[PDB]
């Protein structure tokens, strides 16, 4: 923080709208200056929501990136604790991938890749700043009026000391489908733990199996496991995605799947850095053009 006080204070009475979370709710609102805004009211269930509220303040004081949700202000007044961001018109990536409703059909392959690249750029920057997100997922990737991806939610994120090389050790945190198994079985956390998590998002984008962990089908319950079962050895499956038709150039499909497979390596040792993940994605977007 170069400038210190960005402490906005008590708006109106609550207009029931938009998303809901486990620790607190989120509402849309318009401010005195006409700015459409997003209020993460964290008063429902104060089960150490305090800690995550403060974490999302200091982590987000490095508020200077096009692919990181910009914090406008905070509260902590008369028992309340609300965080404030610009309103993302198009919501989250999950919403656009076999969630529910709103027509004009599905996203394009280019658009999908443009999003994945943008999300990578954000995560890579976090790693430049020794910040490990820990809670990377399709729900946590917001996109604006122009579908520019923005990484949201940092209540679980961790800062390191050595800057880049940090292989730290703490309690296990995250979402069921996205937890780095090495982080789960051992308790060791690394920046590469975000890479596995992002690796799931990649396949989530591809297959539109935006359900990821799905407690209905066969031995294909874990998306980060059923997809690896293919674009690794079993098939290189062109059969895993919804109706992306004959729109993906086979060479880019191999590249995208290969990268997403490499992200999901069991040991963090073998996973690519978000930096390389980024280059690979840009190259897979690139791999959609030239003659013989």
């Amino acid at each position: 923080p170069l400038v210190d006080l960005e402490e906005a204070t008590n708006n109106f009475d609550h207009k029931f709208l938009i998303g809901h979370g486990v620790f607190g709710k989120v509402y849309k609102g318009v401010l005195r200056d006409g700015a459409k805004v997003a209020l993460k009211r964290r008063t429902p269930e104060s089960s150490q929501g305090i800690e995550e509220f403060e974490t999302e303040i200091e982590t987000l004081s490095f508020c200077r990136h096009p692919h990181l949700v910009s914090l406008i202000g905070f509260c902590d007044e008369r028992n309340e604790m609300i965080l404030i961001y610009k309103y993302m018109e198009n919501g989250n990536l999950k919403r656009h991938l076999y969630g529910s409703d709103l027509p004009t059909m599905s996203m394009s392959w280019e658009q999908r890749l443009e999003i994945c690249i943008g999300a990578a750029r954000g995560l890579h920057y976090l790693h430049t700043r020794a910040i490990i997100h820990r809670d990377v997922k399709s729900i946590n990737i917001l996109l604006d009026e122009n579908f520019v991806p923005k990484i949201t939610d940092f209540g679980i994120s961790k800062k390191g000391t050595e800057l880049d090389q940090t292989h730290l050790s703490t309690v296990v945190k995250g979402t069921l489908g996205y937890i780095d198994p090495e982080y789960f079985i051992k308790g060791r956390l690394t920046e590469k733990s975000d890479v596995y998590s992002f690796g799931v998002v990649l396949f989530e984008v591809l297959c539109a199996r935006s359900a990821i962990v799905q407690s209905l089908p066969r031995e294909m319950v874990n998306l980060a496991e059923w997809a690896v079962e293919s674009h690794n050895n079993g098939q290189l499956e062109q059969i895993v995605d919804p109706n992306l038709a004959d729109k993906i150039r086979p060479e880019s499909l191999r590249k995208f799947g290969d990268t997403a497979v490499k992200c999901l390596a069991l040991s963090s040792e073998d996973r690519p850095s978000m930096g390389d993940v980024l280059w690979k994605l840009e190259y897979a977007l690139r791999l959609q053009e030239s003659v013989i």
Binding site: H20, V22, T175, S215
Partner: protein, 101 residues
């Protein structure tokens, strides 16, 4: 909406206590399994396990006992297991019916 962990755990135990067709019905599922369609039991059983586990996971996360967010909201678990209770009381009806033949 707005569902509590105490409320949740209450619905969890409610399902667990009701996931149990009576003796004389089960006596004739491993002896006079009515057709093949009545795997509806063993499919529901495993599903109820899945429901109860996810519910138990959900609870620990809300309580602060664990930092693994299970992936769905607390009201989604109650809606899943309140549903699962009907599935059992239908099995118990379906079996009483099919076996009384």
């Amino acid at each position: 909406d707005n569902v509590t962990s105490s409320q949740l755990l209450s619905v969890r135990h409610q399902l667990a206590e009701s996931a149990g067709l009576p003796r004389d019905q089960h006596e004739f599922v491993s002896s006079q399994a009515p057709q093949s369609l009545r795997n509806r039991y063993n499919n529901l059983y495993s599903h109820t396990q899945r429901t109860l586990d996810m519910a138990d996971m959900q609870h620990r996360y809300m309580t602060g006992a664990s930092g693994i967010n299970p992936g769905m909201l607390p009201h989604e678990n109650v809606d899943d297991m309140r549903s699962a209770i009907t599935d059992w009381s239908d099995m118990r009806e379906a079996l009483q019916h099919a076996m009384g033949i």
